[PDB]
Enzyme design. Structure first.
Site, mmCIF file in Angstrom:
data_model
loop_
_atom_site.group_PDB
_atom_site.id
_atom_site.type_symbol
_atom_site.label_atom_id
_atom_site.label_comp_id
_atom_site.label_asym_id
_atom_site.label_seq_id
_atom_site.Cartn_x
_atom_site.Cartn_y
_atom_site.Cartn_z
ATOM 1 N N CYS A 105 0.828 -1.191 0.000
ATOM 2 C CA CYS A 105 0.000 0.000 0.000
ATOM 3 C C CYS A 105 0.877 1.261 0.000
ATOM 4 O O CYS A 105 1.510 1.528 -1.035
ATOM 5 C CB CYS A 105 -1.069 -0.094 1.096
ATOM 6 S SG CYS A 105 -2.517 0.906 0.705
ATOM 7 N N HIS A 125 -0.147 1.468 -3.486
ATOM 8 C CA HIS A 125 -1.484 1.970 -3.647
ATOM 9 C C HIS A 125 -1.463 3.031 -4.766
ATOM 10 O O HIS A 125 -0.527 3.830 -4.836
ATOM 11 C CB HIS A 125 -1.998 2.635 -2.375
ATOM 12 C CG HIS A 125 -3.474 2.849 -2.405
ATOM 13 N ND1 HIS A 125 -4.051 3.948 -2.999
ATOM 14 C CD2 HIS A 125 -4.501 2.056 -2.018
ATOM 15 C CE1 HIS A 125 -5.362 3.863 -2.904
ATOM 16 N NE2 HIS A 125 -5.663 2.708 -2.346
#
Ligand SMILES: *[C@@]1(=O)C(=O)N([C][C]C2=[C][C]=[C][C]=[C]2)C2=[C][C]=[C][C]=C21
Ligand SMILES: *[C@@]1(=O)C(=O)N([C][C]C2=[C][C]=[C][C]=[C]2)C2=[C][C]=[C][C]=C21
Ligand SMILES: [Cl-]
Ligand SMILES: [Cl-]
EC number: 3.1.2.-
Lengths: 187, 187
Positions: A105, A125
Site C-alpha cells: 500500500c 497503492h
C-alpha cells in the site's frame, strides 16, 4: 527449520494489511514477530483497531535476522516507518544479506525513504504512486503483487491475501502456499 | 444519523474476520463497537493476534440496540459465542426488532446454538456446514455471501471484504458501498 518473519507495527498502520499477512504467515508455519515501532505498548491502527505487539522493535531486532521483513501500509503508519532510523538499519541489513523485504500500500514509500531496492520494479497503492516515484528511482507496476527479486510489493487492503501468499510462496514454496490458500475461501 | 455496529469479540475469533469488517464499516462512516465477550481485556485471536476491545460486551449492551450485530468466525471463537447467554440475549433482541445479524465462517453456528433465523438460507465455511445443518433448520448455500432478509452470512477469511461490503450496502446503501470499495483495490 522454520522461517521467521518480522512485521513492523507503527501507529497508523492499516490494520487489515497488518493482520492478514500475520495470520496467513502463521497458517504457513512461519514464526511471526509483530514488533511495535514505538515500544511494547498497544498500537492504534488507522481505523482505530488496537493491536498488542508481541515485542518492541528494539527487542525483536536482537533476535534477528529474519527471512522476511514486512512493512504494512496506512499513510500515517508508512510515514512513521519512513522516519525511523531503526527501520532504516533493519532494511539496510536485510537488503545487504539478500533477505526478502515485503511492503504493501503506502508501505513501499518507506523503501524510498531508506534508499532500499533502487532500480526495482514496484507497485503501491494508486494514491502513493507519485510519492514512490519521486526521482524515478524505481519502475512502476500496476500488478496486484510485484515481486522483483527480494523486493516484494503490493497495492492495498484488497491485495493483502495475494501479498501474504506471495510471501509464503517465496519462503515456503508453491505447495505450502496452495495448501494455506484453499481453506481461506479466496476467489 | 450514523448507523451503529456491534462486533462481538471472543477468544479464538478469526482476527482477519474481525478486523476486515471493523475497518471497512468504519470506512463507511459506521460507528463500530468492538465488544469483548469476556470483559474489557485484550483478546487473543485464533492466530495469536491480540486485539484490545473498545469495551466489554456487558458495557456495550447498555448502549444498544445496534443496526447490525456482527459475529466473526474462528472455530473456538464461534464456540465461545455459541455458549454465551449474553450473546443469546443480544441476538434474540436483535431478531425481534428486525435488526440485521451478520455472521461469517463458523460464526453462523452461533445462530443455530441460539435458535436465530430458522428457515433462512445461509452459508458457512465449508468445514462448518455439517454443524450448521444439524437438524435441517436452515437451507444451505455455497454463495460467498448469502443475505436472506436480516440474516447475512458468509464463508471465510477470503470472503470477508464481500461480507463487510454487504453489511455496508445493507445499512448505508449501494453508492456508499461502491465508494468505500474503490480505494481498497479489490478484484
Ligand atoms: C493503504 O493502506 C494506504 O497506505 N493508503 C495511503 C495511500 C496514500 C494516500 C495519500 C498519500 C499517500 C499515500 C491507502 C489509501 C486508501 C486505502 C488503503 C490505503
Ligand atoms: C473460519 O474462520 C472458521 O471459523 N473456520 C472453522 C471451520 C470449522 C472447522 C471445523 C469444525 C467446525 C468449523 C475456519 C477454518 C479454516 C479457515 C477459516 C475458518
Ligand atoms: Cl491510511
Ligand atoms: Cl479457526
Amino acid at each position: 527449520a522454520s522461517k521467521r518473519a518480522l512485521v513492523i507495527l507503527a501507529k497508523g498502520a492499516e490494520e487489515m494489511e497488518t493482520v492478514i499477512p500475520v495470520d496467513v504467515m502463521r497458517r504457513a508455519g512461519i514464526k511471526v514477530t509483530v514488533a511495535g515501532l514505538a515500544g511494547k505498548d498497544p498500537v492504534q491502527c488507522s481505523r482505530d483497531v488496537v493491536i498488542c505487539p508481541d515485542a518492541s522493535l528494539e527487542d525483536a531486532k536482537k533476535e534477528g535476522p529474519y527471512d522476511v521483513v514486512v512493512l504494512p501500509g496506512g499513510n500515517l503508519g508508512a510515514q512513521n516507518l519512513s522516519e525511523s532510523a531503526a527501520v532504516k538499519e533493519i532494511l539496510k541489513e536485510q537488503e545487504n544479506r539478500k533477505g526478502l523485504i515485503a511492503a504493501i500500500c503506502a508501505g513501499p514509500t518507506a523503501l524510498l525513504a531508506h534508499e532500499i531496492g533502487f532500480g526495482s520494479k514496484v507497485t503501491t497503492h494508486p494514491l502513493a504512486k507519485d510519492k514512490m516515484m519521486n526521482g524515478g528511482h524505481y519502475t512502476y507496476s500496476e500488478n496486484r503483487v510485484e515481486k522483483d527479486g527480494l523486493i516484494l510489493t503490493s497495492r492495498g487492503p484488497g491485495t493483502s491475501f495475494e501479498f501474504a501468499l506471495a510471501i509464503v510462496e517465496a519462503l515456503n514454496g508453491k505447495e505450502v502456499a496452495a495448501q494455506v490458500k484453499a481453506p481461506l475461501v479466496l476467489k
